[PDB]
Specification:
Chain B: Belongs to the bacterial ribosomal protein bS18 family. Chain B: One of its GO terms (biological process) is translation. Chain B: InterPro entries: Ribosomal_bS18 (IPR001648), Ribosomal_bS18_CS (IPR018275), Ribosomal_bS18_sf (IPR036870). Chain B: It holds the Pfam family Ribosomal_S18. Chain B: It comes from Escherichia coli. The structure is cut from a larger assembly and holds chains A, B and C. By secondary structure, chain A is mostly helical. Chain A has one domain. Helix content of chain A is 54%, strand content 4%. Chain A has six helices and two strands. The radius of gyration of chain A is 17 Å and the shape is globular. The two termini of chain A are 29 Å apart. The longest helix of chain B is centred in the last third of the chain and has 16 residues. Chain B has one domain. Chain B is built from three helices and no strands. Helix content of chain B is 38%, strand content 0%. In chain C, a hairpin with a 4-residue loop joins strand 1 and strand 2. Classes of the chains: A mainly alpha, B mainly alpha, C alpha/beta. Bound molecules: magnesium ion (34 copies). Chain C binds one RNA strand through strand 1, strand 2 and strand 3.
RNA sequence: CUUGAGUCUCGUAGAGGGGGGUAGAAUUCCAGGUGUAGCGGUGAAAUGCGUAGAGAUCUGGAGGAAUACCGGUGGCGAAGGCGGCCCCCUGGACGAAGACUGACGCUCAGGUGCGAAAGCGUGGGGAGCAAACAGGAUUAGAUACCCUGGUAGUCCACGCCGUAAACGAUGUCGACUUGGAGGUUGUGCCCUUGAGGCGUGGCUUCCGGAGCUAACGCGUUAAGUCGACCGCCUGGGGAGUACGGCCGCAAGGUUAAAACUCAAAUGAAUUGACGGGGGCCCGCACAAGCGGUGGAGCAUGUGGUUUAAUUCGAUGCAACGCGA
């Protein structure tokens, strides 16, 4: 994008709930174009989220998001002759994306004898501020001030 | 700028210290003509008068005294 | 021994060193300490941080007299001399005024031939 | 005879020259005062300086040399050159209005004088600076180079020397030939004069027309159009050297060849190279992402080695599941 940065495909909303953020979440969790496999795990995890952690599964989604979605990160740019770890605040979409990435990676770092249970437990701990995704929001807020 | 020609003094004498200290920095140094717009002839006369005054200790050479 | 509460400082500031010494309206010096008088050597002894530490170790070395204000005689363009003057500013001294006392000859003597490369 | 060239009267500007005073910064030194272990230097240190008290700082003194700001390719001078201030002696230029002399002019071989810096002689003086030298950093070797010192010299007097890219690389004098912008210095007239507007000189800077020039460029301050006189040049190198003369205390200067050798040497301009320089803009080049390779097993190619032969070619990107 040297000449003009181009935007992103406005993805089509979730068929089960008409929301577009859960659509981006299932796209993030998807692997090798296996969308059916992905949305199966996503729906399974949100259903049990609506049970083990109170009602409002679609609301518990952002209950975990706003708990993990960062505000500041570092963008090492050499505007002074060397890569300087300058901190920057993000637009909403950047923190949305980083939140969902951090959720799915932590879910994959759990085992829990299923990916449904993995994502469910991880998203619950994230919603009530427990686990590792919240910790990697803590570190991204910590090193954002270290320089 | 073209001051002494508007006034028409025949010679800027060294005694008129009152009219000198405005051609002098607070440090005591002479200010160039390109800043005060004085004509070069009267600039020379000013320089001579100022040096004579500095000698008579009417003006200071510098502030270091 | 005695009190002044408004002294005068002198930062003789070469490109190779920076010495700072204070007295009180009289030239009778009180406390001196050099950037080189603090283990530093080479280019290290010519840094504004060395100026910081020299300012500190003079202020404390004279604090027995407990001065509270300061004139500063900055002389010679040592590298980063605002450094030490504001170090002293923070050291508990309301600096009264600064004075560039860098001696300027009126073509008095022939200077040495400068570096050739 | 008065238009050239001069003289007189009134003024103006100026680092023009010579002499003598004097001032204030700063450097170094000395004297003490305050006040201790660093100062100074560098790539980093060392030599050096500092406990006999530095360095830093204050006061006093001594001494030498040079004159910040003004300051301007601004001014003056034949050129070299000339820079605080004051006085004394003195040269030149320019302007206004007259008066006076009446061609008294221009140029100039030889000649005479002046002539940056270095240098030489004699005697001074000597702060700073600094050839040479000394020492420290230091290799078959110390010279490089840098530091810390440092004499001559730099300064004064009086003698020599007489050379510089002493350059505007442009001899002096006169006349003539379109313009524009300045700087500086006069001076006349004038708007109500100050300011300001019209003039009219001298000097000086930069554009540019005709013209000129090989071109670059010069261009009323000519390298234009002419006149008078002088100096000088005749391929490059040998060589501004040898010999001789003259000059000088000396260093050397000046005048000035030939043998020999080359087929060029040179001037200006043109087009490219000259990337371990700039600037701009591109590309999955990076950034943001996703999946890999590098680890494991196997497939295949190459290198290597082995072999009787392991056919031959392809070898950075742009050879290596390539010819096949
Ligand atoms: Mg004179
Ligand atoms: Mg003095
Ligand atoms: Mg002392
Ligand atoms: Mg002249
Ligand atoms: Mg007659
Ligand atoms: Mg002659
Ligand atoms: Mg002579
Ligand atoms: Mg000489
Ligand atoms: Mg001599
Ligand atoms: Mg002698
Ligand atoms: Mg020396
Ligand atoms: Mg030396
Ligand atoms: Mg040596
Ligand atoms: Mg050398
Ligand atoms: Mg002489
Ligand atoms: Mg000659
Ligand atoms: Mg010259
Ligand atoms: Mg010549
Ligand atoms: Mg002529
Ligand atoms: Mg004129
Ligand atoms: Mg022209
Ligand atoms: Mg002209
Ligand atoms: Mg001519
Ligand atoms: Mg010609
Ligand atoms: Mg010949
Ligand atoms: Mg000769
Ligand atoms: Mg001879
Ligand atoms: Mg002889
Ligand atoms: Mg690529
Ligand atoms: Mg990348
Ligand atoms: Mg492998
Ligand atoms: Mg093969
Ligand atoms: Mg292939
Ligand atoms: Mg094959």
């Amino acid at each position: 994008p040297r000449r003009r940065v181009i935007g992103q495909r406005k993805i089509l909303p979730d068929p089960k709930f008409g929301s577009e953020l859960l659509a981006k979440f299932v796209n993030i969790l998807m692997v090798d174009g296996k969308k059916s496999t992905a949305e199966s795990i996503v729906y399974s995890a949100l259903e049990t989220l609506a049970q083990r952690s109170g009602k409002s599964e679609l609301e518990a989604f952002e209950v975990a998001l706003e708990n993990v979605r960062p505000t500041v990160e570092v963008k090492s740019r050499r505007v002074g002759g060397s890569t300087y770890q300058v901190p920057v605040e993000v637009r909403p979409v950047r923190r949305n994306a980083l939140a969902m990435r951090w959720i799915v990676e932590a879910a994959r770092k759990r085992g829990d004898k299923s990916m449904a249970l993995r994502l469910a437990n991880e998203l619950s701990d994230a919603a009530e501020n427990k686990g590792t995704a919240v910790k990697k929001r803590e570190d991204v807020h910590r090193m954002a001030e270290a320089n | 700028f073209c001051r002494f020609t508007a006034e028409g003094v025949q010679e800027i004498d060294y005694k008129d210290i009152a009219t000198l200290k405005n051609y002098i920095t607070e440090s005591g140094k002479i200010v160039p003509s390109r800043i005060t717009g004085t004509r070069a002839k009267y600039q020379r006369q000013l320089a001579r008068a100022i040096k004579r005054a500095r000698y008579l200790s009417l003006l200071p050479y510098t502030d270091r005294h | 021994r005695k009190q002044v509460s408004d002294g005068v400082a002198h930062i003789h500031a070469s490109f190779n060193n920076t010495i700072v010494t204070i007295t009180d309206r009289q030239g009778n010096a009180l406390g001196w300490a050099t950037a080189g008088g603090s283990g530093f050597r080479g280019s290290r002894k010519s840094t504004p941080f060395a100026a910081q530490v020299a300012a500190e170790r003079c202020a404390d070395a004279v604090k027995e007299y407990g001065i509270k204000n300061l004139e500063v005689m900055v002389k010679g363009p040592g590298p980063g001399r605002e450094s030490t003057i504001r170090a002293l500013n923070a050291a508990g001294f309301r600096i009264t005024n600064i004075t560039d006392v860098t001696p300027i000859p009126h073509n008095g003597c022939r200077p040495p031939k400068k570096r050739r490369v």
